[PDB]
Write a protein that holds these residues in place. Structure first.
Motif, PDB file in Angstrom:
ATOM      1  N   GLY A  96       0.777  -1.225   0.000  1.00  0.00           N
ATOM      2  CA  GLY A  96       0.000   0.000   0.000  1.00  0.00           C
ATOM      3  C   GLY A  96       0.811   1.279   0.000  1.00  0.00           C
ATOM      4  N   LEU A  97       1.473   1.596  -1.110  1.00  0.00           N
ATOM      5  CA  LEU A  97       2.322   2.781  -1.162  1.00  0.00           C
ATOM      6  C   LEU A  97       1.501   4.045  -0.930  1.00  0.00           C
ATOM      7  CD1 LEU A  97       5.163   3.823  -1.586  1.00  0.00           C
ATOM      8  CD2 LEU A  97       4.699   3.954  -4.035  1.00  0.00           C
ATOM      9  N   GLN A  98       2.004   4.925  -0.066  1.00  0.00           N
ATOM     10  CA  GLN A  98       1.297   6.139   0.328  1.00  0.00           C
ATOM     11  C   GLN A  98       1.901   7.413  -0.240  1.00  0.00           C
ATOM     12  OE1 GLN A  98      -1.422   6.893   2.542  1.00  0.00           O
ATOM     13  NE2 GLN A  98      -2.039   4.738   2.431  1.00  0.00           N
ATOM     14  N   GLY A  99       3.221   7.503  -0.340  1.00  0.00           N
ATOM     15  CA  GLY A  99       3.831   8.692  -0.895  1.00  0.00           C
ATOM     16  C   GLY A  99       5.339   8.655  -0.755  1.00  0.00           C
ATOM     17  N   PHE A 100       5.954   9.777  -1.123  1.00  0.00           N
ATOM     18  CA  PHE A 100       7.395   9.962  -1.047  1.00  0.00           C
ATOM     19  C   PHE A 100       7.717  11.088  -0.076  1.00  0.00           C
ATOM     20  CE2 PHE A 100       8.871   7.320  -4.578  1.00  0.00           C
ATOM     21  CZ  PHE A 100       7.697   7.121  -5.269  1.00  0.00           C
ATOM     22  N   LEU A 101       8.877  10.984   0.571  1.00  0.00           N
ATOM     23  CA  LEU A 101       9.372  12.011   1.489  1.00  0.00           C
ATOM     24  C   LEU A 101      10.810  12.329   1.091  1.00  0.00           C
ATOM     25  CD1 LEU A 101       7.896  10.697   4.851  1.00  0.00           C
ATOM     26  CD2 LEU A 101       7.113  12.658   3.529  1.00  0.00           C
ATOM     27  N   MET A 114      12.790  13.960  -9.597  1.00  0.00           N
ATOM     28  CA  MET A 114      11.371  14.292  -9.540  1.00  0.00           C
ATOM     29  C   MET A 114      10.702  14.084 -10.890  1.00  0.00           C
ATOM     30  SD  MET A 114      10.059  15.215  -6.588  1.00  0.00           S
ATOM     31  CE  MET A 114       8.689  16.252  -7.090  1.00  0.00           C
ATOM     32  N   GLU A 115      11.362  14.496 -11.975  1.00  0.00           N
ATOM     33  CA  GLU A 115      10.789  14.306 -13.303  1.00  0.00           C
ATOM     34  C   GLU A 115      10.627  12.827 -13.622  1.00  0.00           C
ATOM     35  OE1 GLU A 115      12.969  16.303 -16.340  1.00  0.00           O
ATOM     36  OE2 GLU A 115      11.377  16.110 -17.837  1.00  0.00           O
ATOM     37  N   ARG A 116      11.655  12.026 -13.328  1.00  0.00           N
ATOM     38  CA  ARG A 116      11.568  10.599 -13.620  1.00  0.00           C
ATOM     39  C   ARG A 116      10.485   9.923 -12.783  1.00  0.00           C
ATOM     40  NH1 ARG A 116      16.169  10.673 -17.125  1.00  0.00           N
ATOM     41  NH2 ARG A 116      16.002   8.452 -17.651  1.00  0.00           N
ATOM     42  N   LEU A 117      10.374  10.295 -11.505  1.00  0.00           N
ATOM     43  CA  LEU A 117       9.336   9.719 -10.655  1.00  0.00           C
ATOM     44  C   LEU A 117       7.943  10.122 -11.126  1.00  0.00           C
ATOM     45  CD1 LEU A 117      10.856  10.010  -7.071  1.00  0.00           C
ATOM     46  CD2 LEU A 117      10.601   7.978  -8.500  1.00  0.00           C
ATOM     47  N   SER A 118       7.768  11.384 -11.529  1.00  0.00           N
ATOM     48  CA  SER A 118       6.474  11.822 -12.040  1.00  0.00           C
ATOM     49  C   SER A 118       6.104  11.071 -13.310  1.00  0.00           C
ATOM     50  CB  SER A 118       6.490  13.327 -12.297  1.00  0.00           C
ATOM     51  OG  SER A 118       5.331  13.732 -13.004  1.00  0.00           O
ATOM     52  N   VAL A 119       7.079  10.841 -14.190  1.00  0.00           N
ATOM     53  CA  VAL A 119       6.813  10.077 -15.406  1.00  0.00           C
ATOM     54  C   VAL A 119       6.440   8.640 -15.065  1.00  0.00           C
ATOM     55  CG1 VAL A 119       7.896   9.099 -17.452  1.00  0.00           C
ATOM     56  CG2 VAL A 119       8.160  11.528 -16.946  1.00  0.00           C
ATOM     57  N   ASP A 120       7.150   8.035 -14.114  1.00  0.00           N
ATOM     58  CA  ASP A 120       6.946   6.620 -13.814  1.00  0.00           C
ATOM     59  C   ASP A 120       5.730   6.400 -12.920  1.00  0.00           C
ATOM     60  OD1 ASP A 120       7.199   3.889 -13.361  1.00  0.00           O
ATOM     61  OD2 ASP A 120       9.386   3.978 -13.204  1.00  0.00           O
ATOM     62  N   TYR A 121       5.720   7.019 -11.740  1.00  0.00           N
ATOM     63  CA  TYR A 121       4.679   6.758 -10.752  1.00  0.00           C
ATOM     64  C   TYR A 121       3.494   7.705 -10.930  1.00  0.00           C
ATOM     65  CZ  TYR A 121       8.021   3.725  -8.409  1.00  0.00           C
ATOM     66  OH  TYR A 121       8.915   2.724  -8.120  1.00  0.00           O
ATOM     67  N   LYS A 168       0.733   9.269  -9.978  1.00  0.00           N
ATOM     68  CA  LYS A 168      -0.442   9.494  -9.144  1.00  0.00           C
ATOM     69  C   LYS A 168      -0.116   9.516  -7.656  1.00  0.00           C
ATOM     70  CE  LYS A 168      -2.917   6.350 -10.865  1.00  0.00           C
ATOM     71  NZ  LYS A 168      -2.091   6.352 -12.104  1.00  0.00           N
ATOM     72  N   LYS A 169       1.000   8.923  -7.244  1.00  0.00           N
ATOM     73  CA  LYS A 169       1.360   8.917  -5.835  1.00  0.00           C
ATOM     74  C   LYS A 169       1.722  10.321  -5.366  1.00  0.00           C
ATOM     75  CE  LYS A 169       0.891   4.513  -5.170  1.00  0.00           C
ATOM     76  NZ  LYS A 169       0.390   4.267  -6.551  1.00  0.00           N
TER      77      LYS A 169
END
Ligand SMILES: CC(=O)O[C@H]1C(=O)[C@@]2(C)[C@H]([C@H](OC(=O)c3ccccc3)[C@]3(O)C[C@H](OC(=O)[C@H](O)[C@@H](NC(=O)c4ccccc4)c4ccccc4)C(C)=C1C3(C)C)[C@]1(OC(C)=O)CO[C@@H]1C[C@@H]2O
Ligand SMILES: Nc1nc2c(ncn2[C@@H]2O[C@H](COP(=O)(O)OP(=O)(O)OP(=O)(O)O)[C@@H](O)[C@H]2O)c(=O)[nH]1
Ligand SMILES: Nc1nc2c(ncn2[C@@H]2O[C@H](COP(=O)(O)OP(=O)(O)O)[C@@H](O)[C@H]2O)c(=O)[nH]1
Ligand SMILES: Nc1ncnc2c1ncn2[C@@H]1O[C@H](COP(=O)(O)OP(=O)(O)O)[C@@H](O)[C@H]1O
Ligand SMILES: Nc1ncnc2c1ncn2[C@@H]1O[C@H](COP(=O)(O)OP(=O)(O)O)[C@@H](O)[C@H]1O
Ligand SMILES: [Mg+2]
Ligand SMILES: [Mg+2]
Lengths: 312, 428, 426, 5, 311
Positions: free
Chosen positions: B122-127, B145-152, B154-155
């Protein structure tokens, strides 16, 4: 004084089917607005303008000044498929399809073809490029790492540069083609180095024994590139770094000249070092920036517009 | 389950993470070697043999501080592949941390994050912990941040950043990096908390009676705030609140998502006595202009929404009384279009003391997260600094020397001006 | 991991480097024979910066010694710490320099630059991640200036993206030992102002003044001056081999301290500095060190800082201290002395803090300044060059080796351009 | 050898 | 005071002198003293009928080339009757390396010297082809410029105005220029043989050598002229002036005809003088041989004053 000209082009058939739209909106004849942000220039041309108007409004005065003991300089900056080759060379034979350089040489010859027989003229031509902050010679591949010095009157020059003579415009065109066939261009015909062309016109008065020397500089500026959006690796990255740094230095020099500051950083890059004589003071320099109005190429258009606006 | 992934990039983020993980290991009763002699799955994962591996990824371009971690008192806790190291630091260059040196370990950290995310249900977010002003903390963060936004995508993503101070500063080219990273932080982040050194220095001076603060105290305070935020996910209590409810209560418009934090009661051991430290006193003191961790007085601004996170021995009647006393006041003004501007959270887990620390063992503590219009002055000062330094184009040949155009500075300045205009126009 | 290549050219450079190597080996706890006899792990943690490993726990420095005379070489080799260098790194000739820039840079230096470059290349390909180059020389000499300039040009040609820092001793007005010194100084500045990432200006007059006034020394020899220079050189790059709260590399200093490409001339400094018998009456705190560092009589360059404004100041502290104290001091120094700083650059001062103090102290600091007052040194050098160039005195020796007057004219023009650049922001 | 016009 | 060199090259006998039944009267009493009509005739250097063009060039033309390279004007002049050996001496067979006359060998040596030194000097080379036919001035470079007038300068030395000027950088350009001149000589001319035997051809070369650094100015004028058959206004003027100069009486009448003023520079003016009279040992041409020998020996009495053209 500094004159900055901007030119636009009409959309080609190769992009009309994809449905792109005009982005530039005009006001009068000196302002172009993109995304509700005005950009004041010295003069803006449109798609309907022909080559002769651009030549008469951008090059005629400097061409006249060269043949009267003074000096001038002309640059050219733009991205790929922005109008650089069309506005510089175009069709090398048509009376209406020629660019700016053919008209320059045609006038520079037709003035000599009229001044009697009591005057003698000499014409010199050199063609050296700047690559990885090292000057190479396009007319002699043996020379590769030439240097820059000054003479007694502290007016810079490049030593060892090949300097041949010409007598007809056809020879000028032939040597232009040979010089262009040695530059550095990556895979559609992407230029990766600056080019400098020199036309030396000097007159000696046979009767009065007065000598007047005039110089004209032609510079083709390579395009700045935002690396993060391309993914350059290895040599291309070094080329991009060098090009960006050189363009920034030239912009700083031009801004310092325009603002009338006490110190002008003439010694920050090789390009400004060579052109120290024909840049400021009683020297008239014109810069032409070519842009495309298709929405596909909005970012590079904004980059070119900002570089042009830096001069002011 | 309820889990979060922690990323510490740059020296400031790494040291903040050191403090944070010390605090968490103390809270859950885990020895440094990972053996304890169910309210802990959020920050750790079991291994089946008694060892616990924290969910954190350490990334840095300089091998100095990560080497301190590798050989310190917590060498047997982290996974050896979590600690990722480069060769040469960013040298206070945005471009070097962004592309020139960034494109050599970013794939490795993406692979490590994917390996960690696959292990969590149940992934909730990043810190993400980073800093504004440094080359790595401002440039390398943008790429990740750009790579995470592209990949994930909605989190939810939360960041904790160190903002440049008005007068106190360390680097010389801080405004450029801060402007670039604050341009990049509006497109991908969801709720970014910003702090600065000067306000924490004053907080240490007055309340804690310490005249010579260092970085460790600041890291401890930031870790305390983060633990207060995550306590609701960790433990149980009446009126609990998780991340998505935080964001739906605290972010009115898509762009107004820049809150400022505050902690109370920060007290010493000698001043721990002689004071009641009641609910009303704690609530009142947290709205003072002198306890804000960003140098911007709330009095020259109007609040929009403030969420109070009580933890410890708290009874809702006292909370309602404190809220009424706050509302009847005149100094603090709320926006007319927000009749209800308080979110209340209560937990049964009191704060935990760290041995050899300046904090005191108190029975209750609160953390107010509010987003007022007063945050615009710091951005104004930084923009003034940037324009004064960029008028002459000083230190620009270093940035353009690493494959960066001259238009990015103007574009980021325009974006920051647009942000300030939007904030002011929504204020009225 | 961030290795440094060290080169010593000329007598002054050789002796400065020998003192520097002795000091560095003492700091890392290395016996002269090359064995390790330290007392902490932090010493061996980052020993690869200056040293190479050898069989049986022995370490040899990454240093290369070059000279045109065989006297300084075997003066060093018989010294207290000459047993540690690599014997194959000794590259030397037989014909003396003769205090001739033209000779060293054209005739007797072109026949020896090949071997020096070969040994540099063999040393530079055994590293993991090369960081930069260190060179020690003096501008007023014959072999020093010319050989160092030639090596700098060649290395900047081979390695184009590395930091090149040189520690050059500068000629002084009232202290001089050569008659043709200004010619060498100008001909060396002509190339240093172009092919160097950051250079540090030191002169003998300021060092003598420091020894006479602050240390209360009786008879200062060359050892004390070389030792002060070694101290500041060691303090420059302490963040590459020891942990700390704020870490600053060489490139970080270059980025923070250099606004424009040409202005990369610095005047170093050090603190604390007291005489024996007066250290028991001094309080060692951050404010005292900050006051001592920003004193006009503490710099190692004979240019008055009050006749100019600082462009960028970098102050690397060493020891245990509070960050608020450092920030408050670096702010109040600027605010109290606003007229001595460039107005349009906020936060002119950078702070770097390391938690490993030098042995035998508790706190230490190095001051690296960039002030417009450095123009007057170039002014004096240029005036002497103009005085001695109208008559073309002592010019048949340089033109007897393959030079031209246009080289002198170009060097003078370049130095004048540098002076004009520095004056602009005053 | 020159080639004047 | 430079000397006037009189050069006597003999030619093999043609068909008409055999048809008259000529005898080989002339005998070389050495390479400079010759006997005709049982009378000695001594010159500077007499060439035999078997002498090659190469030998004549080696003996004569080197010094004039050196002088024009130094800055002194030089003159090479050819004299004789029709079929006395003037034109074939001047060019002969230009494409043949042996039969090439004064012009191709001079051009080759000039270009060899230019390719040899190539110091910090600049050379500008121009050529003008000129003709005189019944005292009519016509330039073959441009046919329309006829009836031109020879003008005067500040130094008051004659020079042709209106003749077209053409620069040269390589020997092939000289060869093509000579070919074009001959082709234009074939235009508007009835017979080449009668025109050659009754007109005069003038070949002109000008050189301007200047140093790049020291910037000294050195200039030189080279004249290559062949006249008509000696078997007439031009010939009357030439005979009168040469006899008066040998006698040293009155003055030299230059306004008699244009060629006299043109040769003023070559003869007695500011130009080195060297003539090569072509003679025949035929008794069928013993009259013209005697006239040529007397003309040459009379001219040998004259010495000229020449100054270097430096400005
Ligand atoms: C009892 C006590 O505290 O003695 C001190 C001392 O009295 C003073 C005066 C020392 C002393 O230094 C000098 O007198 C001196 C001599 C020649 C050149 C420069 C200085 C000292 O000799 C020097 C010595 O320095 C060190 O130990 C540092 O580690 C230093 N080491 C060397 O330079 C060195 C000397 C010999 C052999 C190997 C190394 C160092 C500094 C920077 C970077 C690396 C190393 C110290 C603190 C002292 C004495 C012993 C008296 C001072 O110098 C230094 C470099 O610390 C002079 O002003 C400072 C202030 C010190 O308090
Ligand atoms: N709270 C806190 N702030 C720090 C710490 N270290 C540095 N900072 C702040 O961070 C900023 C400097 O950025 P750093 O994080 O050190 O630089 P970096 O991200 O490592 O980037 P490079 O070192 O340039 O590669 C300054 O504003 C410092 O005050 C720390 O340990 N704790
Ligand atoms: N600090 C220091 N300076 C020196 C030393 N020897 C010479 N100098 C200085 O160096 C300059 C002379 O140059 P030098 O190196 O002796 O000439 P070189 O041997 O040809 O390079 C003068 O300014 C001297 O004062 C030394 O041992 N230590
Ligand atoms: N002002 C113009 N009017 C009409 N056509 C143009 C104009 N400028 C450019 N073009 C068209 O664009 C085409 C390619 O442009 P080009 O000059 O080759 O750009 P690049 O050199 O960057 O490839 C040409 O074939 C030309 O027809
Ligand atoms: N030295 C010589 N050897 C061989 N043939 C010659 C010689 N001189 C002249 N002739 C030939 O006699 C003919 C007439 O000579 P030419 O030079 O035309 O006479 P001119 O020009 O004096 O009238 C030509 O065929 C020529 O080649
Ligand atoms: Mg770092
Ligand atoms: Mg004939």
């Amino acid at each position: 004084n500094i004159k900055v000209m901007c030119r636009f082009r009409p959309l080609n058939e190769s992009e009309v089917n994809r449905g792109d739209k005009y982005i530039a909106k005009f006001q009068g004849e000196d302002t172009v607005v993109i995304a509700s942000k005005p950009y004041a220039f010295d003069r803006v041309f449109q798609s309907s303008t022909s080559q002769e108007q651009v030549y008469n409004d951008c090059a005629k005065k400097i061409v006249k000044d060269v043949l009267e003991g003074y000096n001038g300089t002309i640059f050219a900056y733009g991205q790929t498929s922005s109008g650089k080759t069309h506005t510089m060379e175009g069709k090398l034979h048509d009376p209406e399809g020629m660019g700016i350089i053919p008209r320059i040489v045609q006038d520079i010859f037709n003035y000599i073809y009229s001044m009697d027989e009591n005057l003698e003229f000499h014409i010199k031509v050199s063609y050296f490029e700047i690559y990885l902050d090292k000057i190479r010679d396009l007319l002699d591949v043996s020379k590769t790492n030439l240097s820059v010095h000054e003479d007694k009157n502290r007016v810079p020059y490049v030593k060892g540069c090949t300097e041949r003579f010409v007598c007809s415009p056809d020879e000028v065109m032939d040597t232009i083609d040979e010089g262009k066939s040695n530059r550095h261009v990556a895979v559609e015909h992407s230029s990766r180095s600056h080019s400098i062309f020199l036309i030396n016109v000097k007159q000696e008065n046979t009767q009065t024994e007065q000598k007047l020397s005039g110089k004209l500089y032609l510079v083709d500026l390579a395009g700045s590139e935002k690396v993060s959006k391309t993914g350059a690796e290895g040599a291309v990255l070094d080329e991009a770094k060098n090009i960006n740094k050189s363009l920034s230095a030239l912009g700083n020099v031009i801004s310092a000249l325009a603002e009338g500051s006490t110190y002008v950083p003439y010694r920050d890059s090789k390009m400004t070092r060579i052109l120290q004589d024909s840049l400021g003071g009683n020297c008239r320099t014109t810069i032409v920036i070519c842009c495309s109005p298709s929405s596909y190429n909005e970012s590079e258009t904004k980059s070119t517009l900002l570089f042009g606006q830096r001069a002011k | 389950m309820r889990e979060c992934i922690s990323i510490h990039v740059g020296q400031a983020g790494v040291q903040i993470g050191n403090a944070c993980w010390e605090l968490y290991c103390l809270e859950h009763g885990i020895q440094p070697d990972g053996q304890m002699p169910d309210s802990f799955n959020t920050f750790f994962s079991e291994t089946g043999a008694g060892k616990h591996v924290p969910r954190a990824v350490f990334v840095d371009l300089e091998p100095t501080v990560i080497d301190e971690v590798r050989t310190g008192t917590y060498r047997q806790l982290f996974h050896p592949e979590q600690l990722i190291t480069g060769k040469e630091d960013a040298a206070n260059n945005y471009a070097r941390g962004h592309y020139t040196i960034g494109k050599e370990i970013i794939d490795l950290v993406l692979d490590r994050i994917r390996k960690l995310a696959d292990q969590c249900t149940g992934l909730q977010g990043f810190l993400v912990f980073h800093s504004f002003g440094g080359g790595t903390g401002s440039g390398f963060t943008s790429l990740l941040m750009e790579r995470l936004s592209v990949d994930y995508g909605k989190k939810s993503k939360l960041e904790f950043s160190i903002y440049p101070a008005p007068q106190v500063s360390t680097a010389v080219v801080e405004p450029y990096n801060s402007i670039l990273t604050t341009h990049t932080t509006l497109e991908h982040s969801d709720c970014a908390f910003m702090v600065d050194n000067e306000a924490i220095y004053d907080i240490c001076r007055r309340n804690l009676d310490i005249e010579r603060p260092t970085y460790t105290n600041l890291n401890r305070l930031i870790s305390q705030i983060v633990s207060s935020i995550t306590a609701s996910l960790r433990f149980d209590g009446a009126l609990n609140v998780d991340l998505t409810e935080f964001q739906t209560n605290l972010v009115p418009y898509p762009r107004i998502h820049f809150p400022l934090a505050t902690y109370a009661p920060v007290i010493s051991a000698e001043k721990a006595y002689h004071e009641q430290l009641s609910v009303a006193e704690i609530t009142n003191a947290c709205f003072e202009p002198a306890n804000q961790m960003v140098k911007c007085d709330p009095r020259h601004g109007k609040y929009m929404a403030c969420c109070l996170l009580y933890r410890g021995d708290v009874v809702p009647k006292d909370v309602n009384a404190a809220i009424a006393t706050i509302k009847t006041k005149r100094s603090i003004q709320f926006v007319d279009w927000c009749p209800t501007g308080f979110k209340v959270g209560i937990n049964y887990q009191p704060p935990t003391v760290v041995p050899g620390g300046d904090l005191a063992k108190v029975q209750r503590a609160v953390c107010m997260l509010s987003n007022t219009t007063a945050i615009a002055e710091a951005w104004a000062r930084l923009d003034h600094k940037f324009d004064l330094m960029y008028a002459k184009r000083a230190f620009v040949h270093w940035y353009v020397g690493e494959g960066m155009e001259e238009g990015e500075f103007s574009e980021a300045r325009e974006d920051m001006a647009a942000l300030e205009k939007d904030y002011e126009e929504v204020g009225v | 991991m961030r290795e440094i290549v060290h080169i010593q050219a000329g007598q002054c450079g050789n002796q400065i480097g020998a003192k520097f190597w002795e000091v560095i080996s003492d700091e890392h706890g290395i016996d002269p024979t090359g064995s390790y006899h330290g007392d902490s792990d932090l010493q061996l943690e980052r020993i690869n910066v200056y040293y190479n490993e050898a069989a049986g726990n022995k370490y040899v420095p990454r240093a290369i010694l070059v000279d045109l005379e065989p006297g300084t070489m075997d003066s060093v080799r018989s010294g207290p710490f000459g047993q540690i260098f690599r014997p194959d790194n000794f590259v030397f000739g037989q014909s003396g320099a003769g205090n001739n820039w033209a000779k060293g840079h054209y005739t007797e230096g072109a026949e020896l630059v090949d071997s020096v470059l070969d040994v540099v290349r063999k040393e530079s390909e055994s590293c993991d991640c090369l960081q930069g180059f260190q060179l020690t020389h003096s501008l007023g000499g014959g072999t020093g200036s010319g050989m160092g300039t030639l090596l700098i040009s060649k290395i900047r040609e081979e390695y184009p993206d590395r930091i090149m820092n040189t520690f050059s001793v500068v000629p002084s007005p009232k202290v001089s030992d050569t008659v043709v010194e200004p010619y060498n100084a100008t001909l060396s500045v002509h190339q240093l102002v172009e092919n160097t990432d950051e250079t540090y200006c030191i002169d003998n007059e300021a060092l003598y003044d420091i020894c006479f006034r602050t240390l209360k020394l009786t008879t200062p020899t060359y050892g004390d001056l070389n030792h002060l220079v070694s101290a500041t050189m060691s303090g420059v790059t302490t963040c590459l081999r020891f942990p700390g709260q704020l870490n600053a590399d060489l490139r970080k200093l270059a980025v923070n301290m250099v606004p424009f490409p040409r202005l990369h001339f610095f005047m170093p400094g050090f603190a604390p500095l007291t005489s024996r018998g007066s250290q028991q009456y001094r309080a060692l705190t951050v404010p005292e060190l900050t006051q001592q560092m920003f004193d006009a009589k503490n710099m190692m360059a004979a240019c008055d800082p009050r006749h100019g404004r600082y462009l960028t100041v970098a102050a690397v502290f060493r020891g245990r201290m509070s960050m608020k104290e450092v920030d408050e001091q670096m702010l109040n120094v600027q605010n109290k002395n606003s007229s001595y700083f460039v107005e349009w650059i906020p936060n002119n001062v950078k702070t770097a803090v390391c938690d490993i103090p030098p042995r035998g102290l508790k706190m230490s600091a190095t001051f690296i300044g960039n002030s417009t007052a450095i123009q007057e040194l170039f002014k004096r050098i240029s005036e002497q060059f103009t005085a001695m160039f109208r008559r073309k005195a002592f010019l048949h020796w340089y033109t007897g080796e393959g030079m031209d007057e246009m080289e002198f004219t170009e060097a003078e023009s370049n130095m004048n351009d540098l002076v004009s650049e520095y004056q602009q922001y005053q």
